[PDB]
């Protein structure tokens, strides 16, 4: 027989992590691996249809994606849907698939609104999720002995689909659910200048542990303003939620990184200010299989799509897709091994959930909620040469923290500052 896979991704724009120019080679590699493996679907072939989820302007929209999904369903009637990545575009498509009882597979849309299975049923997310960041934050708070208060700030920028809104809300909800502590939040505009002054005036009266979701340039400007005002690392700590590693180029294997220098004439001041800043990023795979997959992915993409890919954590987004696809195939086989049909949906989704799989990224696990557990990394600056390096890794499958080569998380004073000063905020 034939198996149809429907993809709803931007086929023209090549600026998104889930763009077709970076996913198509991964899908081709997954199909080749499935064909070369007699274990997965013996005697069956897999097809693929594509649809555009962007308007004339070239950006993902919540109007074109549902129409494309409906047209694909009417014309081909596929068994599984791939994508989209944008939350506003994927959510109506997810609801449509749930109503149609058609399984949905994705690695994007990490918004908390997809965490409820009553509405978004038969939906699997094989990519990173914002709840795992909240779990990492809770684990770090438990390890560092902070249980009183926290402060949250996020920046608003016109042009994107509120990148620092869903992440902040999901992490905030997860912290409230798990830690049961008082947490505040605030939104600021990075374009304005008086907003920074108001932020530096209001931070000392709201807390001492601050999480910031903004651009690396905005973070550097805020850190410089804090240094000039009088803020020091002995009482304040700053965390930057750079999941894709923009401040540090790529976030690849070990190499000296100096995000405080850009040749603006104030490199010394930025270097001194960044003594109290840490970055939270994703964890790159270490097995050579990941390197080989990256090499083949880059080669095939260059030869077949006229696109030149770079080195970074963004490449971890399409790869998960690949792995997820493989998992789906296995589940189908299990259904075909238990006297079933490929048009059930519920059985395949139930079999996929709460399962351990091995892929190019490594050993992944899917819980009962259909959300892949992701590892995280914390970057710290070397006090000697002033370069950031990886010092702590968090495993979500076992929820544990591990150091790297015995590295010690140094502090300006000697131990982490207390969550609330003895004199209080007054």
């Amino acid at each position, epitope marked *: 027989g034939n198996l149809t896979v429907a993809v709803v991704l931007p086929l023209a724009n090549t600026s998104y992590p889930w763009s077709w120019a970076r996913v198509g080679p991964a899908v081709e590699l997954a199909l080749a691996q499935v064909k070369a493996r007699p274990d997965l679907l013996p005697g*069956w072939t897999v097809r693929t249809v594509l649809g555009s989820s962007e308007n004339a302007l070239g950006v993902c929209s919540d109007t074109a994606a549902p129409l494309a999904a409906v047209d694909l369903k009417w014309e081909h009637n596929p068994a599984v849907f791939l994508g989209p990545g944008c939350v506003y575009a994927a959510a109506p498509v997810g609801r449509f698939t749930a109503h149609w009882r058609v399984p949905l597979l994705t690695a994007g849309a990490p918004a908390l609104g997809f965490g409820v299975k009553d509405e978004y049923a038969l939906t699997t997310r094989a990519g990173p999720s914002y709840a795992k960041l909240g779990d990492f934050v809770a684990a770090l708070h438990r390890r560092l002995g902070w249980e009183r208060q926290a402060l949250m700030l996020y920046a608003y920028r016109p042009g994107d689909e509120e990148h620092c809104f869903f992440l902040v809300e999901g992490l905030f909800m997860r912290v409230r659910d798990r830690l049961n502590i008082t947490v505040d939040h605030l939104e600021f505009a990075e374009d304005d200048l008086s907003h920074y002054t108001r932020l530096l005036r209001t931070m000392p009266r709201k807390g001492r542990v601050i999480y910031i979701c903004s651009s690396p340039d905005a973070f550097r400007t805020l850190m410089l303003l804090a240094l000039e005002a009088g803020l020091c690392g002995e009482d304040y700590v700053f965390f930057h939620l750079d999941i894709f590693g923009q401040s540090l180029q790529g976030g690849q294997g070990p190499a000296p990184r100096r995000p405080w220098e850009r040749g603006d004439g104030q490199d010394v001041s930025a270097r001194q200010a960044f003594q109290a800043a840490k970055i939270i990023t994703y964890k790159d795979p270490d097995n050579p299989e990941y390197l080989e997959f990256l090499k083949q992915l880059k080669h095939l993409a260059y030869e077949q799509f006229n696109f030149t890919m770079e080195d970074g954590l963004v490449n971890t987004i399409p790869a998960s897709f690949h792995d997820g696809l493989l998992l789906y195939i296995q589940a189908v086989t299990e259904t075909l091994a238990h006297g*079933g049909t490929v*048009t059930d949906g519920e059985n395949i989704t139930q079999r996929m959930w709460n399962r351990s799989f091995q892929g190019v990224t490594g050993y992944l696990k899917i819980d009962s909620s259909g959300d892949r557990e992701t590892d995280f990394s914390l970057w710290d600056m070397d006090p000697e040469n002033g370069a950031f390096r990886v010092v702590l890794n968090y495993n979500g499958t076992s929820q544990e923290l591990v150091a790297v080569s015995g590295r010690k998380l140094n502090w300006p004073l000697g131990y982490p500052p207390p969550d609330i000063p003895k004199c209080g905020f007054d």
Partner: antibody
Amino acid sequence: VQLVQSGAEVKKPGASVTVSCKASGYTFTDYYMHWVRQAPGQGLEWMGWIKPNSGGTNSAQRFQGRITMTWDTSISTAYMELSRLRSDDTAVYYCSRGGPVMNYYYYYGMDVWGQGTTVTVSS
Amino acid sequence: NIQMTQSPSSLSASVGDRVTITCRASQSIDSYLNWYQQKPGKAPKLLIYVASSLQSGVPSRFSGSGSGKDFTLTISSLQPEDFATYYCQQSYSIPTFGQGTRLEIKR
């Protein structure tokens, strides 16, 4: 390839009826077994099918409530059990085989059919 | 589920005529269709097992074609033993049977 059935009993509603299907002459554990019921004047009506080697079972939404189908590989026979019989269960039952089990070709048509059995429900 | 429709409901034709029967599905199916013929007092016999093949032991005068949501079963020359009830069944999902199509002679 031979398919043999037996049974023409009539009984009051609320009782149970059993149908035996024999699949001698060919490898019973190498093909699917489909049970199909046809009403006297409505038409054909698919009920369900079983997979002997993998122990698989499939049934319709409106029939899974009160049907239990088993098999015996020692003599290559299949048994169909129906309970909670009403006045709408008076029809003709057929057993047939179709689709190899080495490859999951469940969409293959039923090649060899049975002779059929008649079950009547009345008080 | 998928509802299957047969056209025409009834048709009368003479011996050695060209006849076509159309089967329509409410949902798109690639090639999952089977054609069965049934005579009174006899079990149905399979004719076509996919969209356009021919089962062994079936005369070559029968043909099948179509795709998507519409399929056609064609008989080039009618014979006295070719008058029976025809059913088209889908196999992509939980199988369903059509309402049938009665064929009779012309008088």
